[PDB]
Amino acid sequence: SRAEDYEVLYTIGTGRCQKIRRKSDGKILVWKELDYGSMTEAEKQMLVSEVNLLRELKHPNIVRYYDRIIDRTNTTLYIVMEYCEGGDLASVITKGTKERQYLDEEFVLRVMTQLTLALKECHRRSRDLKPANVFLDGKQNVKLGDFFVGTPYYMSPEQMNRSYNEKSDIWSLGCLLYELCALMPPFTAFSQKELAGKIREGKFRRIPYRYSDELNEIITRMLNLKDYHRPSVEEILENPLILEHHHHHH
Ligand SMILES: COc1cc(-c2cnc(N)c(N3CCC(C(=O)O)CC3)n2)cc(OC)c1OC
Ligand SMILES: [Cl-]
Ligand SMILES: [Cl-]
Ligand SMILES: [Cl-]
Ligand SMILES: [Cl-]
Numbered sequence: 139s140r141a142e143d144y145e146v147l148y149t150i151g152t153g154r155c156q157k158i159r160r161k162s163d164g165k166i167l168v169w170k171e172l173d174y175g176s177m178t179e180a181e182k183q184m185l186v187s188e189v190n191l192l193r194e195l196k197h198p199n200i201v202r203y204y205d206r207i208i209d210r211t212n213t214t215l216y217i218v219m220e221y222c223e224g225g226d227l228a229s230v231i232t233k234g235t236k237e238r239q240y241l242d243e244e245f246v247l248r249v250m251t252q253l254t255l256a257l258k259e260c261h262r263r264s265r266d267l268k269p270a271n272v273f274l275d276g277k278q279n280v281k282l283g284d285f286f287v288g289t290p291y292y293m294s295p296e297q298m299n300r301s302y303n304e305k306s307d308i309w310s311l312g313c314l315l316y317e318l319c320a321l322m323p324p325f326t327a328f329s330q331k332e333l334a335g336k337i338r339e340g341k342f343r344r345i346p347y348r349y350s351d352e353l354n355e356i357i358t359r360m361l362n363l364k365d366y367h368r369p370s371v372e373e374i375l376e377n378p379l380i381l382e383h384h385h386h387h388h
Pocket of ligand 3: 239
């Protein structure tokens with residue numbers, strides 16, 4: 139409830155994200171620093187609405203947001219959440235590139251399974267689905283988090299023309315799983331106009347051959363140009379590839 143109840147250990151990323159320890163029990167967590175000092179009251183009311191919505195999101199595959207803290211003399215809002223020791227998927231992918239080493243299919247199956255269930259929960263309740271918004275804990279669990287300039291690698295053909303569309307999320311997941319496998323996005327280009335052209339032709343290289351035809355097929359379906367040809371979250375979870383151990387475990 140009060141920032142004094144926690145001790146900052148060190149900064150993770152820079153508002154700042156920080157690893158913290160709760161004094162009462164020694165519990166490891168993180169908080170996100172939001173400086174609302176230059177925000178209007180209308181923007182603060184907005185921010186309050188968003189923070190109450192985060193508190194309501196309880197799901198093994200979604201970053202758990204525990205608390206909120208206001209420091210009035212620092213005009214700083216702190217969002218306290220679980221600590222995900224594994225970092226984000228972006229870093230995993232960049233690690234793969236450097237190591238010249240592809241990720242295990244088992245790992246890709248875990249991400250596919252757990253992110254789909256995350257998405258399934260988000261739809262039931264009715265955000266940005268990219269590697270830098272997907273996090274890993276210390277137990278092989280995958281969690282969706284974070285609810286110009288640069289190219290929109292994952293922008294679906296519908297979003298290009300015109301979402302809101304749940305099949306648009308499936309395309310984004312396809313892009314993400316594809317980049318996990320090939321260590322590069324399915325569609326690359328130097329300009330957003332070139333990119334859009336590539337996206338509309340709907341063509342891409344098969345994921346590397348170390349990955350099964352079955353994994354390649356489901357990712358390919360998610361990247362269908364027609365939103366109605368992409369599998370739903372339910373049809374995804376029905377896939378013979380997806381087994382119990384791919385799901386979360388406490
Ligand atoms: C240990 O290495 C890293 C950890 C994290 C990290 C760990 N736990 C988190 N809860 C977390 N947050 C930060 C942003 C959140 C938000 O936007 O709501 C959700 C997840 N991050 C992050 C790292 O770099 C990105 C990292 O190093 C690779
Ligand atoms: Cl969990
Ligand atoms: Cl490689
Ligand atoms: Cl085609
Ligand atoms: Cl290839």
